[PDB]
């Protein structure tokens, strides 16, 4: 009952919202895998008219690549309460977001018969704080 | 101009403001009068003015008859008497006037009016049993300022 209910890190996305790059360099070095250009929709007076055009980069980490990153990332942030998502996700920080979920998320991410995860099976802030807090650090 | 020019409901319904422009503002000062903070259910007596013929009443008449009626109440039951009268109809029908002779005669916008079906209640007042004769007089004055003949109908009030 528990085994297929206990949280896990599905992905940790680390991106730098610049606005016009050289940044990709450090991300690859801090994460362990290639970066990703980040374009933008709509035009802004902030000389940011070019719809499609580099502006930032990101990296989606999974499995060890994500843990080995948190084993040093987390230690550099004072996790708080309000810093948590309604689904048990939290973003701190250079941006570093952590997506937490239960063992059957693939049901909502696969192509065939895909379905959305029932709320009861959804993660909660508490359940999130718990899992994480239970891994070398403190909550609030 | 005479109401003889607009009292009949023979033209199409003409109310779509997304297609009509330059509609004159309504002269109707207010629809809810008396003590509008109180409820109509807080009164024992409820009398309404009922239009006996389906017609069109221009905003100028509604105001005139509403005014002459409420003004009476205010005068008899003081500026803050225990009562509340309501004008339930709003002048949605836009009016034209062709003011070339019959050439390109679609008239220009000159006003608004409310279409009232016979049997409907134009006004509805609410008072205590000791004011019925005043609200009845207010209504009498009001129906002298609109085209149709009307009934001063007493609804909740078996205190006769």
């Amino acid at each position: 009952f528990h085994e297929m209910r206990e949280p896990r890190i599905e992905k940790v996305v680390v991106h730098m919202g610049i606005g016009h790059a050289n940044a990709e360099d450090i991300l690859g070095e801090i994460t362990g895998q290639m970066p990703v250009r980040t374009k933008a929709k709509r035009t802004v007076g902030e000389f940011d008219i070019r719809e499609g055009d580099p502006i930032g980069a990101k990296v989606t980490l999974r499995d060890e690549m994500a843990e080995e990153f948190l084993q040093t990332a987390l230690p550099l942030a004072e996790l708080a309460t309000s810093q948590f998502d309604d689904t048990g996700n939290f973003s701190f920080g250079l941006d570093v977001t952590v997506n937490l979920v239960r063992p059957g998320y693939r049901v909502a991410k696969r192509d065939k018969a895909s379905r959305s995860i029932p709320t009861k099976h959804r993660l909660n802030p508490a359940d999130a704080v718990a899992f994480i807090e239970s891994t070398y650090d403190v909550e609030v | 101009k005479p109401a003889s020019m607009y009292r009949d409901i023979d033209k199409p319904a003409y109310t779509r403001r997304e297609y009509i422009t330059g509609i004159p503002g309504s002269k109707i000062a207010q629809h809810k009068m008396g003590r509008k903070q109180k409820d109509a259910d807080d009164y024992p007596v409820q009398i309404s003015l009922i239009v006996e013929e389906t017609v069109q009443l221009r905003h100028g008449s509604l105001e005139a008859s509403r005014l002459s009626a409420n003004r009476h109440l205010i005068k008899e039951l003081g500026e803050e008497g225990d009562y509340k009268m309501t004008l339930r109809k709003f002048p949605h029908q836009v009016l034209r006037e062709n003011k070339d002779g019959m050439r390109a005669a679609f008239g220009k916008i000159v006003g608004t009016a409310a279409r009232v079906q016979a049997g409907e209640q134009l006004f509805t007042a609410y008072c205590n049993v000791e004011d019925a004769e005043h609200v009845k007089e207010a209504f009498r004055r009001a129906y002298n300022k609109i085209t149709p003949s009307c009934r001063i109908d007493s609804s909740p009030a078996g205190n006769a």
Binding site: D111, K112, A113, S114, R115 | -
Partner: protein, 186 residues
Amino acid sequence: ATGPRYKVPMRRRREARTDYHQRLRLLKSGKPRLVARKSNKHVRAQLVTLGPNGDDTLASAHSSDLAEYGWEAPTGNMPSAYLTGLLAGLRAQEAGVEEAVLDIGLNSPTPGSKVFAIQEGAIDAGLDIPHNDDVLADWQRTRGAHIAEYDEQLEEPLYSGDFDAADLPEHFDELRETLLDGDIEL
């Protein structure tokens, strides 16, 4: 859901099981559909035709009823797929069916995939189906050579149950051979 004006997808679209846009281009041929479906453990192949109250299945084959002929290995891989296609293809032939168009449902047209395998099989059973040879996997991978050579990087059995250690794509040959043979009770 929300109001009288709300639009609810066709049931099989809510279920995310049928792609009606592809279903249409597919039905246009006028030929029976060779439905190729997968499971985590199994592979299915059906020959479907249009009917007054829903589709009619004229012949099918499931990777499981493959054992009914000697298959003693897993039933959700390439050799398994190909064979399930050939089997369904043979029954189809028996049913008077001669041609069909490959319907892979919500699966991806990835080169060398199992659906194209189910396709190569049905085709070999003698069924004419619009196809493209170089989108099919090379003969060896259909046999199971990719899995055998994988067990070479052994150190530990690729198969838990006791079905050899280095596996046998020969079993594939022996099975195919069995189906091609005129006898075999379809």
